[PDB]
């Protein structure tokens, strides 16, 4: 169970992940979204750890952590990160690597490597960006190894090559509290728009799930408990096939609390696309739009705790995730339902774009947020 310090940092991380999601959703080069709040927050913690003056103060400001001592930020986020990789009680597959790539000519300060390793498990390697073919190979191979092949290549190009690249590579596979049957899979169309359909594999289960149909805002919301019920995957989907902009305007922490309070445990037939969704985001511009203006600026950044010198700036914040929808989960008894309870289920038929998030059941704090707009398929 998280300390009160870590719980406060989880809340800061959740508030930031929400603001970032909304910023990225307004960008029409952004299709699928996959974001881990503690990992986004750790990018800001690293900037605070490696920066001075306004470079670092902006990082804490974007995290709404102005009234936390610097050491409290790094400690609380570190406990969070270590908790997500604990695997003691969770039974949920989570692989995370964090690596700071610096130019070959820039020596990381011994104090910063120890601290970033201690708090953020951050790895460090100088790479020479003159040799681009090899630079991409270092990054992509490191990410593939971090995720055991689930994320085989994070990026095809590095645009700004004169600064630091922060790369986070992740694999996340929610493990259901009540598993889907491995044979309840078939092939159906996913409607990206009303004129473009992609053939997908869908997985299906009928069970008792917390559920709410908002007829007035034409959306459904369903709660899927993960293994041992210490977090839940929440799915939000409009009635019609439509851009998610309208739903995203409604989505807030407050509105979610209203929705969840209206939920009732009912028989629901859930149909979801099955498979791996891979997304790489460069958060650089979006963090800057949220207030991290100087760290990302070749001419302003003060990251001299990272390197001793002051020409280093944050060129990229790569946030790369493989999120796998699969049937596996905990087994469940004969029948905790009866012949009666599962008849005439509501359908939650996710054959068109939806928003999803993972919430901590205890503190209601966000633990993952994304949307599926265009699945992979042949």
């Amino acid at each position: 169970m998280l300390s009160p310090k870590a719980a406060t940092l989880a809340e800061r991380s959740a508030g930031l992940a929400f603001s970032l999601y909304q910023a990225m959703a307004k960008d029409q080069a952004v299709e699928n979204i996959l974001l881990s709040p503690v990992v986004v927050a750790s990018s800001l913690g690293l900037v605070s750890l490696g920066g001075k003056a306004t470079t670092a103060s902006q990082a804490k400001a974007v995290l709404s952590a102005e009234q936390l001592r610097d050491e409290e930020v790094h400690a609380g986020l570190g406990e969070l990160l270590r908790s997500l990789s604990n695997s003691t009680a969770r039974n949920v597959t989570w692989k995370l690597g964090s690596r700071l790539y610096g130019p070959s000519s820039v020596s990381f300060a011994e104090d910063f490597v120890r601290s970033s390793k201690q708090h953020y498990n951050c790895e460090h390697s100088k790479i020479n960006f003159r040799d681009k073919r090899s630079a991409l190979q270092s990054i992509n191979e490191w990410a593939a190894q971090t995720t055991d092949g689930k994320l085989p290549e994070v990026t095809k190009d590095v645009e700004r090559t004169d600064g630091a690249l922060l790369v986070n590579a992740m694999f996340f596979k929610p493990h259901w509290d009540e598993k889907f049957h491995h044979k309840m899979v078939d092939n159906r169309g996913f409607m990206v728009t009303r004129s473009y359909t992609v053939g997908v594999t869908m997985m299906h289960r009928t069970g008792l799930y917390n559920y709410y149909d908002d007829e007035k805002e034409k959306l459904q919301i369903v709660e899927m408990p993960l293994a041992h019920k210490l977090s839940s995957l929440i799915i939000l989907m409009p009635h019609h096939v439509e851009p998610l902009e309208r739903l995203e305007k409604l989505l807030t922490k407050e509105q979610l609390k209203i929705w969840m309070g209206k939920m009732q445990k009912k028989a629901v037939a859930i149909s979801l696309p099955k498979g791996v969704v891979e997304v790489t985001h460069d958060l650089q511009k979006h963090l800057a739009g949220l207030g991290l203006t100087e760290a990302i600026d070749k001419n302003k950044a003060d990251l001299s705790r990272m390197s001793g010198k002051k020409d280093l700036y944050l060129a990229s914040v790569f946030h790369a995730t493989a999120f796998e929808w699969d049937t596996e989960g905990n087994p469940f008894d004969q029948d905790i339902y009866g012949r009666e309870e599962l008849r005439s289920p509501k359908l939650f038929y996710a054959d068109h774009p939806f928003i999803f998030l993972v919430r901590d059941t205890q503190s209601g704090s966000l633990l993952f947020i994304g949307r599926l707009v265009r699945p992979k398929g042949d």
Partner: peptide, 19 residues
């Protein structure tokens, strides 16, 4: 014994507007 048949599928999406 096999489980009972699944539910009917969802209604198709509404048609497009006219000319």
């Amino acid at each position: 014994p096999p489980g009972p048949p699944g539910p009917p599928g969802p209604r198709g999406f509404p048609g497009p507007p006219g000319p």
